[PDB]
Amino acid sequence: MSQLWVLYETYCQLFSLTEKVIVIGNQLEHHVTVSSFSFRNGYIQIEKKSSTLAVLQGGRQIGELKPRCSITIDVQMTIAWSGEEQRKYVYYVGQQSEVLVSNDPQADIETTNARFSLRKHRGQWVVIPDDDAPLFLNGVQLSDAVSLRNGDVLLCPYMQFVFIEEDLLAVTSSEEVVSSLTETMPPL
C-alpha cells in the first residue's frame, strides 16, 4: 500500500494511492473530503512523480513528500506519506496482560511514532493514550482510555494496529517494527 494520512482538527483520514493526481478539498467528489475547511487558498493537489509526491496548493508547488515524510499547511492540516511499501507483522499476545508502545528501552513495540499502552481486562483490551503522542481510533483522536472491539483500528502517522482476535495483534508500518513480542509469522 501507498497511503496518505490527512490530519486536521481531531481527525485523521487514511487514503490509498492505488489514480495519479488526487485532490483534497471540501466537496464530496474530491478524493479526500474535509468539509469543515474553506480551501480559499486552493484545494490541495497531490500528484505522483515516477519516488516522490508533488504537493501543490493553487496549482503551484509548496512541497514534495518523500516516503515517511509529512507536510503541514495553512488553510492547519498535516499530510504525511508512507512511501510506496508497507509491511505487516502479527504478534501472539494471548499470554500478555499489557503491551507498551513507545520509545522507551523496555517497550514491547519500539517506535518514535506513537506512545500508548494496551491493557487486558477480563478478556478485553483497553487503549490508554499518552497526553503527548496523538493517536486515532477509527479516525478520531483519543482523549482518554477506551475499551476496544475487534477491527477497531488504531492509527498514528505511519503505523496501524489492529486486533485480529483477542490474542493476535497486527501492526502495519512503513519501517521494520522492533518488538519483544512473539511473532506468529514471518513479516508480510
Short mmCIF file of C-alpha atoms in Angstrom, two decimals:
data_model
loop_
_atom_site.label_atom_id
_atom_site.label_comp_id
_atom_site.label_asym_id
_atom_site.label_seq_id
_atom_site.Cartn_x
_atom_site.Cartn_y
_atom_site.Cartn_z
CA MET A 1 0.00 0.00 0.00
CA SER A 2 0.86 3.65 -0.52
CA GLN A 3 -1.17 5.69 1.88
CA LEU A 4 -1.57 9.30 2.84
CA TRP A 5 -2.67 10.45 6.13
CA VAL A 6 -4.69 13.57 6.31
CA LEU A 7 -4.70 15.10 9.77
CA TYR A 8 -6.81 18.11 10.78
CA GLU A 9 -8.73 19.19 13.93
CA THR A 10 -9.10 15.91 15.95
CA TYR A 11 -9.37 13.58 12.89
CA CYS A 12 -7.03 11.52 10.80
CA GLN A 13 -8.23 10.14 7.42
CA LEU A 14 -6.17 7.49 5.63
CA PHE A 15 -6.36 7.36 1.83
CA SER A 16 -4.83 4.75 -0.51
CA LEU A 17 -2.91 5.79 -3.65
CA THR A 18 -3.72 2.65 -5.80
CA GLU A 19 -5.04 7.18 -9.53
CA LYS A 20 -2.27 9.74 -10.48
CA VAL A 21 -3.34 13.31 -9.42
CA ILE A 22 -5.62 13.49 -6.37
CA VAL A 23 -7.28 16.37 -4.65
CA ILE A 24 -8.12 17.13 -1.09
CA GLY A 25 -10.89 19.59 -0.80
CA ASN A 26 -14.39 20.17 0.71
CA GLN A 27 -16.72 18.66 -1.93
CA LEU A 28 -17.98 15.05 -1.83
CA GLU A 29 -16.50 14.46 -5.34
CA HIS A 30 -12.89 15.04 -4.21
CA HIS A 31 -10.66 12.18 -3.35
CA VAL A 32 -10.39 13.24 0.31
CA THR A 33 -13.29 15.42 1.66
CA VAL A 34 -12.60 17.83 4.54
CA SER A 35 -15.92 19.69 4.75
CA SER A 36 -15.09 21.82 7.75
CA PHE A 37 -12.36 23.76 5.76
CA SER A 38 -12.81 26.65 3.17
CA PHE A 39 -9.82 26.00 0.88
CA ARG A 40 -9.81 29.71 -0.02
CA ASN A 41 -6.12 29.36 -0.94
CA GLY A 42 -6.92 26.42 -3.31
CA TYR A 43 -7.68 22.78 -2.86
CA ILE A 44 -4.66 20.58 -2.21
CA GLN A 45 -3.35 18.62 -5.09
CA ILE A 46 -1.13 15.63 -4.61
CA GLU A 47 0.43 14.08 -7.70
CA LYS A 48 2.85 11.15 -8.16
CA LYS A 49 6.16 11.72 -9.99
CA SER A 50 7.67 8.35 -11.15
CA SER A 51 9.70 8.13 -5.91
CA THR A 52 8.06 11.33 -4.52
CA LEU A 53 4.71 13.17 -4.30
CA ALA A 54 4.36 16.69 -5.53
CA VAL A 55 2.22 18.83 -3.27
CA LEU A 56 0.55 21.81 -4.87
CA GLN A 57 -1.95 24.19 -3.24
CA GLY A 58 -3.07 26.57 -6.01
CA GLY A 59 -1.72 24.52 -8.86
CA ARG A 60 1.59 25.74 -7.51
CA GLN A 61 4.05 23.56 -5.67
CA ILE A 62 4.53 24.06 -1.93
CA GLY A 63 6.49 20.84 -1.31
CA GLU A 64 7.41 17.34 -2.21
CA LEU A 65 6.89 14.42 0.03
CA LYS A 66 9.33 11.57 0.22
CA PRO A 67 8.45 8.31 1.84
CA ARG A 68 7.71 8.63 5.58
CA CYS A 69 7.72 12.44 5.42
CA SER A 70 4.91 14.92 6.07
CA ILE A 71 3.95 18.46 5.39
CA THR A 72 1.96 20.97 7.36
CA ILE A 73 -0.08 23.55 5.52
CA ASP A 74 -2.26 26.59 6.28
CA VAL A 75 -5.95 26.56 5.12
CA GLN A 76 -3.99 23.96 9.78
CA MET A 77 -3.67 20.45 8.19
CA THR A 78 -0.88 17.81 8.01
CA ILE A 79 -0.35 15.35 5.11
CA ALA A 80 2.03 12.52 5.51
CA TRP A 81 3.05 9.82 3.11
CA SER A 82 4.05 6.25 3.91
CA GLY A 83 6.02 5.69 0.75
CA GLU A 84 5.35 3.01 -1.77
CA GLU A 85 5.86 -0.02 0.55
CA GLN A 86 4.48 -1.25 3.85
CA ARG A 87 4.81 -4.43 5.92
CA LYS A 88 2.68 -6.44 8.33
CA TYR A 89 3.71 -8.21 11.49
CA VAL A 90 1.38 -10.30 13.60
CA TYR A 91 2.08 -10.95 17.22
CA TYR A 92 0.62 -13.51 19.56
CA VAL A 93 -0.26 -11.77 22.83
CA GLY A 94 -2.55 -14.36 24.47
CA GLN A 95 -0.13 -14.61 27.38
CA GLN A 96 0.16 -10.83 27.86
CA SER A 97 -1.98 -8.55 30.02
CA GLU A 98 -0.09 -5.34 28.92
CA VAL A 99 1.59 -4.02 25.69
CA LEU A 100 3.61 -0.78 25.83
CA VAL A 101 4.17 1.11 22.66
CA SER A 102 6.74 3.90 22.99
CA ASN A 103 10.36 4.79 22.57
CA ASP A 104 11.37 3.52 25.96
CA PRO A 105 14.07 0.78 26.07
CA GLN A 106 11.63 -1.65 27.69
CA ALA A 107 8.77 -1.10 25.17
CA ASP A 108 7.08 -4.23 23.84
CA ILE A 109 6.86 -2.41 20.48
CA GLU A 110 9.56 0.21 19.87
CA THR A 111 8.73 3.34 17.91
CA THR A 112 9.36 7.06 17.84
CA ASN A 113 5.89 7.37 16.14
CA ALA A 114 3.43 6.61 18.97
CA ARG A 115 3.21 6.34 22.67
CA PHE A 116 0.37 4.46 24.34
CA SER A 117 -0.31 1.30 26.27
CA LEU A 118 -2.68 -1.61 25.72
CA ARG A 119 -4.14 -3.43 28.72
CA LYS A 120 -6.15 -6.51 29.01
CA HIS A 121 -9.03 -6.64 31.48
CA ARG A 122 -11.45 -9.62 31.68
CA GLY A 123 -10.70 -10.61 28.09
CA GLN A 124 -10.98 -7.04 26.73
CA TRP A 125 -8.16 -4.82 25.53
CA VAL A 126 -8.16 -1.19 26.63
CA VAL A 127 -6.12 1.51 24.90
CA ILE A 128 -4.64 4.16 27.25
CA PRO A 129 -3.12 7.02 25.28
CA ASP A 130 -0.48 9.47 26.42
CA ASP A 131 -1.04 13.21 26.64
CA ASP A 132 1.91 13.99 24.34
CA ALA A 133 1.53 11.49 21.33
CA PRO A 134 -1.59 11.98 19.09
CA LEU A 135 -3.41 8.67 18.49
CA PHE A 136 -6.59 7.94 16.47
CA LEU A 137 -9.31 5.29 16.99
CA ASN A 138 -11.19 4.80 13.78
CA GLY A 139 -10.07 8.29 12.61
CA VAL A 140 -10.89 10.20 15.82
CA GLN A 141 -8.32 11.45 18.33
CA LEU A 142 -8.48 9.71 21.71
CA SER A 143 -8.68 11.93 24.78
CA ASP A 144 -8.94 9.13 27.38
CA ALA A 145 -8.78 5.33 27.79
CA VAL A 146 -11.21 3.31 25.61
CA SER A 147 -12.14 -0.37 25.57
CA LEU A 148 -11.57 -1.85 22.13
CA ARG A 149 -13.67 -4.21 19.96
CA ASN A 150 -12.24 -6.43 17.10
CA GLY A 151 -11.47 -4.35 14.00
CA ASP A 152 -11.24 -1.12 15.85
CA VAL A 153 -8.19 0.47 14.09
CA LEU A 154 -5.59 2.46 15.95
CA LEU A 155 -3.64 4.93 13.77
CA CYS A 156 -0.80 7.34 14.22
CA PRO A 157 1.41 8.79 11.37
CA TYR A 158 2.92 5.89 9.50
CA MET A 159 1.55 2.95 11.59
CA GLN A 160 -1.64 0.85 12.18
CA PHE A 161 -2.56 -1.54 14.99
CA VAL A 162 -5.50 -3.98 14.68
CA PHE A 163 -6.51 -6.81 16.99
CA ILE A 164 -7.47 -9.57 14.58
CA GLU A 165 -8.55 -11.60 17.62
CA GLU A 166 -8.23 -11.12 21.35
CA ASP A 167 -4.93 -12.98 21.19
CA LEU A 168 -3.47 -11.53 17.90
CA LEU A 169 -2.23 -8.02 17.19
CA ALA A 170 -1.34 -6.89 13.70
CA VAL A 171 0.91 -3.95 13.21
CA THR A 172 1.47 -2.31 9.79
CA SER A 173 4.28 0.09 9.25
CA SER A 174 6.45 1.63 6.62
CA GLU A 175 9.52 0.62 8.70
CA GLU A 176 10.55 -2.68 10.24
CA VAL A 177 8.92 -2.90 13.67
CA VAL A 178 11.07 -3.69 16.68
CA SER A 179 9.32 -5.90 19.16
CA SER A 180 9.96 -8.19 22.08
CA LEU A 181 6.59 -9.91 21.36
CA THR A 182 6.00 -13.40 19.87
CA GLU A 183 5.81 -13.32 16.09
CA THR A 184 3.19 -15.79 14.74
CA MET A 185 4.53 -15.38 11.18
CA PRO A 186 7.39 -14.18 9.05
CA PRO A 187 6.62 -10.46 8.36
CA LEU A 188 4.49 -9.60 5.25
#
